[PDB]
Amino acid sequence: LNELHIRPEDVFNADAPFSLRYEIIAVNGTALPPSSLSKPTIIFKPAV
């Protein structure tokens, strides 16, 4: 996200920050359906 130049606060921001596109590639190359795995989520972590 830093090279993307998107600040972490932009995630909370009312602006639509981003999303992610995931995909699964099998060992033999036959990509599996994305339904075989759950939906990834974005977590935040504050400073200590």
Partner 1 sequence: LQSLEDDTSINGFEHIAAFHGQPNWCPSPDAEKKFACCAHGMAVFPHW
Ligand X SMILES: *[C@@H]1O[C@H](CO)[C@@H](O[C@@H]2O[C@H](CO)[C@@H](O[C@@H]3O[C@H](CO)[C@@H](O)[C@H](O)[C@@H]3O)[C@H](O)[C@H]2NC(C)=O)[C@H](O)[C@H]1NC(C)=O
Under the rule (CB under 8 A), what is the footprint of partner 1?
23, 30-35
Alpha-carbon dihedral angle through residues 23, 42, 4, 34, given to the nearest 10 degrees: 10
Size of the site for ligand X (CB under 6 A): 4
d(CA 10, CA 2): 12
Q: Pick one of ligand X, partner 1, none as the site partner of residue 34 (Cβ within 5 to 8 A by kind).
A: partner 1
Contact 42, 20 (CB under 8 A): yes
Measured from the CB of residue 6, what is the shortest distance to ligand X in angstroms?
Answer: 34
Residues that bind ligand X (CB under 6 A): 26, 28, 30, 32
